[PDB]
Amino acid sequence: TVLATSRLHIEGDFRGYGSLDKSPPGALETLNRLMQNNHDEFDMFWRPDAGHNHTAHSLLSVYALGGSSADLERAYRDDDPHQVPIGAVDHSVVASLKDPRIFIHRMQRLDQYSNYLRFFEERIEARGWKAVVVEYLFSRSDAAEAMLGQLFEGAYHPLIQLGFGIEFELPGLVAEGLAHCAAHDAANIIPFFQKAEKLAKSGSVAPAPLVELYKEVRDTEKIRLAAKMTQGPVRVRDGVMGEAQDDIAAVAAKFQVGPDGLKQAIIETTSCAAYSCGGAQRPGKVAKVDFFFMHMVTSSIFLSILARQDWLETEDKIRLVEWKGRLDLVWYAASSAPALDRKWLEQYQPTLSAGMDWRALYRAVTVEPDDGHLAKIVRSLKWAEEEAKGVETSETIPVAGSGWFKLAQMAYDSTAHLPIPAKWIMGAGYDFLWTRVDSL
Amino acid sequence: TVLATSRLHIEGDFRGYGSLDKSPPGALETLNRLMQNNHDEFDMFWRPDAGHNHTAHSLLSVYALGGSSADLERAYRDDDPHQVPIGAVDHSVVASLKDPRIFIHRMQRLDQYSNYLRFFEERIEARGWKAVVVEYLFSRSDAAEAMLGQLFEGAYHPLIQLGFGIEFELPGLVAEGLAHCAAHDAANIIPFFQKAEKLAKSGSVAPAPLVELYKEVRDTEKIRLAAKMTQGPVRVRDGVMGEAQDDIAAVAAKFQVGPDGLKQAIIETTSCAAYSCGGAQRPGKVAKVDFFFMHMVTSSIFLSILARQDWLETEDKIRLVEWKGRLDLVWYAASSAPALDRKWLEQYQPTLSAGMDWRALYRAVTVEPDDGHLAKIVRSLKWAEEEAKGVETSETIPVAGSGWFKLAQMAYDSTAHLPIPAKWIMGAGYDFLWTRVDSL
Numbered sequence: 044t045v046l047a048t049s050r051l052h053i054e055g056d057f058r059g060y061g062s063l064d065k066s067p068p069g070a071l072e073t074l075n076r077l078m079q080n081n082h083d084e085f086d087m088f089w090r091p092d093a094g095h096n097h098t099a100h101s102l103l104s105v106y107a108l109g110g111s112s113a114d115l116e117r118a119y120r121d122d123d124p125h126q127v128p129i130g131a132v133d134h135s136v137v138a139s140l141k142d143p144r145i146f147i148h149r150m151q152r153l154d155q156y157s158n159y160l161r162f163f164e165e166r167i168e169a170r171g172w173k174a175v176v177v178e179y180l181f182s183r184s185d186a187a188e189a190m191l192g193q194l195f196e197g198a199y200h201p202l203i204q205l206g207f208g209i210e211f212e213l214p215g216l217v218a219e220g221l222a223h224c225a226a227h228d229a230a231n232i233i234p235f236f237q238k239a240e241k242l243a244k245s246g247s248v249a250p251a252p253l254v255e256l257y258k259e260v261r262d263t264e265k266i267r268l269a270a271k272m273t274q275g276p277v278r279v280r281d282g283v284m285g286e287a288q289d290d291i292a293a294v295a296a297k298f299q300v301g302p303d304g305l306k307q308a309i310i311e312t313t314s315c316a317a318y319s320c321g322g323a324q325r326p327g328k329v330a331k332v333d334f335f336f337m338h339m340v341t342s343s344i345f346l347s348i349l350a351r352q353d354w355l356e357t358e359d360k361i362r363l364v365e366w367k368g369r370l371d372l373v374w375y376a377a378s379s380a381p382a383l384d385r386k387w388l389e390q391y392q393p394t395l396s397a398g399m400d401w402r403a404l405y406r407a408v409t410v411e412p413d414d415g416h417l418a419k420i421v422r423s424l425k426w427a428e429e430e431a432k433g434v435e436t437s438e439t440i441p442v443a444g445s446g447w448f449k450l451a452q453m454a455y456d457s458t459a460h461l462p463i464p465a466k467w468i469m470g471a472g473y474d475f476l477w478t479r480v481d482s483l
Numbered sequence: 484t485v486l487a488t489s490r491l492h493i494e495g496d497f498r499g500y501g502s503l504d505k506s507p508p509g510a511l512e513t514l515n516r517l518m519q520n521n522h523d524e525f526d527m528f529w530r531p532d533a534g535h536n537h538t539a540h541s542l543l544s545v546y547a548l549g550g551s552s553a554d555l556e557r558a559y560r561d562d563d564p565h566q567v568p569i570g571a572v573d574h575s576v577v578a579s580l581k582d583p584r585i586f587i588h589r590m591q592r593l594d595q596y597s598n599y600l601r602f603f604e605e606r607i608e609a610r611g612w613k614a615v616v617v618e619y620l621f622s623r624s625d626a627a628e629a630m631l632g633q634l635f636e637g638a639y640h641p642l643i644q645l646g647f648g649i650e651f652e653l654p655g656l657v658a659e660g661l662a663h664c665a666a667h668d669a670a671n672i673i674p675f676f677q678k679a680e681k682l683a684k685s686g687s688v689a690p691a692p693l694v695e696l697y698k699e700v701r702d703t704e705k706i707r708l709a710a711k712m713t714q715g716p717v718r719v720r721d722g723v724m725g726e727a728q729d730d731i732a733a734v735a736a737k738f739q740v741g742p743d744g745l746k747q748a749i750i751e752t753t754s755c756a757a758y759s760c761g762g763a764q765r766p767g768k769v770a771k772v773d774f775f776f777m778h779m780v781t782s783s784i785f786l787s788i789l790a791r792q793d794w795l796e797t798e799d800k801i802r803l804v805e806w807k808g809r810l811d812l813v814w815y816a817a818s819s820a821p822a823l824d825r826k827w828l829e830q831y832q833p834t835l836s837a838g839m840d841w842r843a844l845y846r847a848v849t850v851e852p853d854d855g856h857l858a859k860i861v862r863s864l865k866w867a868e869e870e871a872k873g874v875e876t877s878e879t880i881p882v883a884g885s886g887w888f889k890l891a892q893m894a895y896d897s898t899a900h901l902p903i904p905a906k907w908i909m910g911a912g913y914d915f916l917w918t919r920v921d922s923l
């Protein structure tokens with residue numbers, strides 16, 4: 044049967060966190076048609092590693108930046124490579140997924156995306172999307188505890204997918220997010236999360252500022268050297284988790300958020316992510332932003348949005364932010380824990396984006412051929428400026444004030460007018476990748 | 484200890500199977516400098532899947548086709564993406580590999596390439612390359628039986644690497660091929676080879692022509708549908724082998740070469756591979772050659788070269804051709820066992836290569852931006868024409884005579900002037916991939 048949940052219809056004036064100009068007339072009709080087409084026709088995964096379908100991210104991010112119909116059609120066409128036929132649904136499997144032991148058994152298999160999508164659309168039709176998200180992520184059932192680790196997989200793509208669904212209150216996009224979460228292949232991060240949380244809750248680990256834990260990752264050779272450059276998309280599974288899981292779990296346990304610390308922890312994790320992006324530069328080289336660090340920033344807006352949900356308990360919001368900052372240490376390790384310095388972003392002189400304000404940068408981004416990452420990082424940074432309003436740089440907050448926009452300018456300047464493979468550096472700590480980057 | 488084996492130096496006038504025009508003066512000096520740089524500086528593997536370094540293949544194929552110094556420099560620059568720093572050697576690991584248990588225990592790990600390379604350069608320094616190849620591939624030890632399955636891994640890359648070292652009698656390149664063979668990640672093909680051979684030698688399985696075995700693979704839904712499109716580089720491991728290993732082993736067991744049948748089996752396996760490339764076209768679509776089928780043809784020249792080695796028993800040459808023809812069914816299944824028809828190559832009208840002969844096509848290939856696959860497929864097809872001279876098309880030989888050059892023209896026409904990702908179709912049996920191909 045046709046589910047009401049399957050129809051993705053955005054209506055009303057809500058146009059995204061970090062929005063400035065409203066999209067001109069016609070854009071919402073185009074967004075609705077393309078979002079529905081993508082929902083119905085395309086899989087979540089188009090290849091076995093780094094294969095996340097970004098179509099919904101690119102569309103909603105371009106809409107939030109005030110893009111027109113033509114800018115949404117551009118976003119959609121730029122992500123043609125991400126768009127492959129959705130897998131056939133087995134309705135027998137969908138019925139069996141209501142059994143939580145079968146639900147757990149079938150997780151972490153990419154080919155199950157469409158089965159979990161039909162399952163979550165059916166559950167959301169019956170119970171409403173808020174009730175289903177609480178049940179399957181926050182209820183502390185065996186299934187929800189697995190799902191919560193899965194939510195951070197693949198450099199935060201399930202958190203992003205679910206985040207957009209929550210942000211726009213789109214029940215069928217919430218279903219995509221939960222199905223993405225269930226089906227994502229495992230990087231062996233669940234035991235890292237369990238180990239670090241068990242140490243953090245023991246009473247025996249003193250909390251430390253996140254910026255000091257990045258330094259501990261770089262300064263601990265066994266963690267720093269765990270990932271290998273040519274492990275590429277499996278640096279986390281085969282390197283950081285395979286060689287140094289216990290070691291990095293002991294570092295991550297020191298990131299602890301007190302019951303009044305939610306807003307400050309979102310600012311701290313977002314600031315340290317931005318610091319990684321801006322600060323991992325090399326003398327004599329043009330500015331480049333690390334692909335993985337960019338994901339630490341693009342995902343950060345969804346922590347701010349989750350933090351504002353009235354159907355979610357403060358203790359769950361705090362747990363999300365703790366796990367996110369802990370996994371940011373893992374992605375930092377996976378880029379070979381590059382030296383960070385605040386001077387790079389402080390001293391950066393914008394090129395293509397010089398003299399622009401946010402409105403002008405937003406408009407430049409809406410037309411730039413891209414898979415959605417430029418629109419996502421620029422929006423997360425505009426939003427970070429709002430979240431962190433009145434917070435200045437300090438020993439624990441490495442980026443703030445003018446730094447949020449300066450990083451958005453750097454991201455634009457270092458990616459615009461390049462083919463997608465030249466845009467982002469695929470691990471800033473690996474000396475060899477800088478031999479392929481332009482000298483000043 | 485500097486080894487004599489680590490020096491790669493081609494001298495004399497041997498310029499490769501299928502060679503026509505001699506390279507002009509300066510080419511040999513350029514080849515020797517680039518071959519040595521690649522041998523010394525670069526790993527065999529630049530990413531975890533489909534990450535084979537083709538530099539040696541591209542240089543030696545362009546040289547065989549009569550390329551100039553500038554054609555060799557282009558081939559080398561075009562394979563810059565394949566060229567990443569060689570892994571550090573652990574000399575204590577190299578000493579331990581003398582123990583057959585430790586040798587076997589460390590196999591199938593990409594990161595051990597440089598450790599196996601040093602090991603094989605040391606063994607070849609002591610015993611000569613022929614004795615080391617017999618010991619580690621053909622001696623029937625536990626290690627050699629494992630190595631022999633590994634030789635066909637990753638669509639025949641270890642076989643190609645070793646084949647060029649044997650072809651040019653380059654001890655250091657033979658070392659490259661054995662080390663590639665040892666280190667290559669496993670696709671669970673070793674048990675396929677074991678199950679198919681056991682059935683073939685049981686006396687319970689009547690032999691059948693290879694063309695009927697391609698047909699049986701397509702006509703058996705369990706085998707044809709085992710691989711999924713979005714499994715990409717792991718279709719064999721996670722699809723054909725994961726779902727249908729026993730089923731396809733039973734089909735492959737029917738390919739059986741009699742004691743005088745070596746030359747006919749090389750022609751039959753090469754003709755069926757060429758038929759896959761030429762024959763898997765679609766109505767209303769421009770011609771495109773399947774990437775994996777192309778490997779089934781590029782590797783074929785090395786079966787012919789191995790067949791002419793006086794140090795290798797006839798039984799071992801026959802065993803190579805049986806295993807290769809059997810794994811060709813697995814690669815056909817991995818591309819979703821497309822319908823083949825002899826009309827496409829018979830009716831094909833050359834476009835860019837219209838009116839060229841072999842010498843003009845060779846010259847056109849030497850200058851074409853490419854990673855080495857075009858040079859390799861055109862050389863294999865010129866050689867196939869010599870191997871199969873006087874053999875006409877039949878019920879069991881689907882491609883012959885003018886078909887070899889016609890397919891070479893099709894490969895040039897369908898790849899020239901395109902960026903690398905657009906050159907070859909990544910699984911001709913998947914209908915969806917043809918929606919991205921140009922209409923006639």
Ligand SMILES: [Fe+3]
Nearest residue numbers: 095097338416
């Ligand atoms: Fe992404």
Ligand SMILES: [Fe+3]
Nearest residue numbers: 535537778856
């Ligand atoms: Fe290849």
